[PDB]
């Protein structure tokens, strides 16, 4: 999952010009025989100095692949499990903050020995407390993300995870549904019997 | 992603450091040095193999010299030294010849005496008459 999150978003904008795309090189520079030098065709051959590249990178390359659903969900479960097991996962309630001081959070983390980086996870985006928003808008190692923004790469990048209790319930109900679900006859976006 | 080689200096130097004592352009030009270094290493291996043979021949020549200096031929000296259960290799025999003239003369006298003992035994063709130095001792 960590490799997939890094790779599937990649589109390499590396395009070099082959011998057919270089400007000139439309005629033979010299006749085949009698000159005494090596035989050549277009002066834009890859052997020549100003010639094109033999293979090189060709056009925008889209590195895109989709891992299966039960592999991505399992990776999320394993990330949560290892974070809990290594004493790096902390459950906080309601994510309330007494003051908008960004330095207060740093002192709280240092006193609780959370580490260098902390990822706070909230349930919703518009329901975030403005105190926490203002506190984490100026901090680098402390990152505030909503419940739909949880990912293995960020969970491994940040040393400590902090989850709100409704977020814990939300993640629980999201991850436990794939254990006993059908294969999608049509995409789960469209209305189902029990699924929204 | 254009990838170029930056340690080409060290790659060339790792080969050129073994060719600095060569003569001509082989000690400077890299194209001429790789072939010279490879042949140098091949010759080094071949000569390491031949060094044992060359030194053995040198030791044999020295043992001869010191043997006909005592009026004894090398094959007779060697066979009669073996017959006396004296298992000294050619290197040690040459060392004794160069640095221990008296010990080498004693060895030559013993080998000769064994030679006349064998000759007398062959002439006599008798089971009972046996020489003093011709007796064979078993392992203990």
């Amino acid at each position: 999952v960590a490799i997939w999150q890094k790779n599937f978003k990649r589109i390499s904008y590396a395009k070099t010009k082959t011998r057919a795309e270089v400007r000139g090189g439309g005629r033979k520079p010299w006749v085949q025989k009698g000159s005494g030098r090596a035989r050549h065709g277009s002066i834009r051959s890859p052997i020549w100095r100003g010639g094109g590249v033999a293979h090189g990178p060709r056009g925008p390359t889209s590195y895109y692949y989709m891992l299966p659903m039960k592999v991505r969900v399992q990776g999320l479960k394993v990330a949560l499990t290892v974070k809990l097991a290594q004493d790096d996962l902390h459950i906080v309630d309601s994510l309330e903050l007494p003051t908008a001081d960004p330095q207060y959070l740093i002192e709280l983390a240092r006193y609780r020995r959370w580490g260098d980086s902390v990822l706070l996870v909230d349930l919703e985006h518009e329901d975030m407390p403005q105190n926490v928003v203002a506190a984490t808008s100026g901090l680098k190692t402390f990152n505030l993300v909503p419940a739909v923004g949880l990912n293995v790469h960020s969970m491994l990048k940040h040393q400590t995870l902090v989850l709100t209790l409704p977020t814990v319930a939300f993640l629980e109900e999201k991850l436990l549904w794939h254990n006993s679900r059908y294969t999608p006859l049509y995409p789960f976006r469209l209305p189902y019997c029990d699924f929204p | 992603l254009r990838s170029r080689v930056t340690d080409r200096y060290w790659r060339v130097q790792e080969v050129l450091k073994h060719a600095r004592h060569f003569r001509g352009r082989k000690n400077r030009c890299y194209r001429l040095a790789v072939r010279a270094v490879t042949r140098a290493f091949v010759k080094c291996t071949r000569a390491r193999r031949l060094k044992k043979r060359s030194l053995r021949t040198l030791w044999i020549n020295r043992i001869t010299a010191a043997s006909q200096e005592h009026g004894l031929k090398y094959p007779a000296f060697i066979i009669n030294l073996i017959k006396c259960q004296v298992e000294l290799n050619r290197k040690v025999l040459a060392d004794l010849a160069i640095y221990e003239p008296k010990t080498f003369k004693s060895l030559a006298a013993l080998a000769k005496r064994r030679r006349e003992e064998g000759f007398a035994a062959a002439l006599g063709d008798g089971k009972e008459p046996d020489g003093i130095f011709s007796r064979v001792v078993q392992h203990r």
Binding site: Q5, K6, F8, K9, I11, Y13, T18, A20, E21, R58, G59, P60, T61, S62, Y63, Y64, Y65, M66, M69, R72, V73, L76, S117, K140, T141, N143, V145, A147, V148, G149, L150, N151, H153, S154, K157, F170, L171, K174, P187, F188, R189, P196 | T6, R8, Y9, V12
Partner: protein, 97 residues
């Protein structure tokens, strides 16, 4: 092989900037969001590569099919030549056949 004689300035790059902190944050948007949007919509780039992958010939064909009518003259000609060359090399050339 002449290497530079001076040390280059050390590139002081921070691993905790905005992009390196927010990278891949919404990759599980579908999984954790009552499926409404695939991770396809999060792919930013050319129109013909938003959630697609293929070899050079397939990429060229797809590019010509979608944006081929809006191309420039010289790039369209180069694309046609490249398509022809890739077709010929892929179908008539090779070892395993």
């Amino acid at each position: 092989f002449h290497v530079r004689v001076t040390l280059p300035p050390r590139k002081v790059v921070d691993r905790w900037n905005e992009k390196r902190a927010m990278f891949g944050v919404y990759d599980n948007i579908g999984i954790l969001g009552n499926f409404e949007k695939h991770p396809k919509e999060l792919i930013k780039g050319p129109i013909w590569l938003r959630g697609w992958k293929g070899n050079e010939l397939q990429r060229c064909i797809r590019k010509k099919r979608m944006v081929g009518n809006r191309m420039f003259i010289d790039d369209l000609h180069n694309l046609n030549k490249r398509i022809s060359y890739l077709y010929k090399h892929f179908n008539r050339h090779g070892k395993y056949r």
